[PDB]
Amino acid sequence: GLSDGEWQQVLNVWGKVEADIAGHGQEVLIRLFTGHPETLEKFDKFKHLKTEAEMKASEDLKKHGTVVLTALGGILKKKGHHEAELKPLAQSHATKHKIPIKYLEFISDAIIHVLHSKHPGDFGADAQGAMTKALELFRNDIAAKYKELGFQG
Ligand code: HEM
Numbered sequence: 001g002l003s004d005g006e007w008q009q010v011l012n013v014w015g016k017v018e019a020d021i022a023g024h025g026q027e028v029l030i031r032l033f034t035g036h037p038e039t040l041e042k043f044d045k046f047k048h049l050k051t052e053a054e055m056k057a058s059e060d061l062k063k064h065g066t067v068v069l070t071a072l073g074g075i076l077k078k079k080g081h082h083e084a085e086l087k088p089l090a091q092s093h094a095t096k097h098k099i100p101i102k103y104l105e106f107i108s109d110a111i112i113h114v115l116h117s118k119h120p121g122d123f124g125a126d127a128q129g130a131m132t133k134a135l136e137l138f139r140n141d142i143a144a145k146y147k148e149l150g151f152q153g
């Protein structure tokens with residue numbers, strides 16, 4: 001898992017996100033949808049967003065980015081002890097939303113990108129390593145639940 005030091009870096013980075021949760025969440029989803037338009041198709045409520053300008057102008061997209069990063073933050077603050085928090089998300093994303101684990105890889109990559117973009121020169125090599133490890137742990141634990149359920153997508 002992650003060391004004590006590594007969790008400290010994760011939660012330090014997370015403080016940056018928390019100062020503007022909606023702004024970070026918006027930019028994460030925009031990066032996901034523009035880089036991987038197939039992901040937009042999983043959201044009936046964002047399918048009407050035909051341009052990045054429309055995406056930026058959508059208050060509902062910001063609202064969802066808030067929901068998404070708030071959930072992730074709750075999970076990260078558990079420092080790996082997140083079975084209760086993670087299980088329902090795994091189950092809704094596999095059985096209801098039909099989200100392949102590839103799409104979680106995409107959003108993980110989008111979070112790293114957004115952190116650099118919003119905090120250029122203030123997201124150090126150690127911090128990137130730690131955040132990357134935490135997102136991998138999150139994805140790996142979801143993947144285990146996906147395997148239980150026989151879900152591929
Ligand atoms: C950091 C990873 C993610 C987190 C923490 C997360 C969290 C959430 C939460 C808390 C909800 C609302 C409750 C629920 O339905 O379980 C939700 C809904 C949803 N999620 Fe995610 N999600 C993540 C990644 C993704 C990805 C990558 C996609 C698609 C590419 C996706 C698709 C959806 C959809 C389609 C909904 C329902 C949206 C609606 O209200 O119409 N999720 N997610």
Ligand SMILES: [O-]
Nearest residue numbers: 064065067068
């Ligand atoms: O989501």
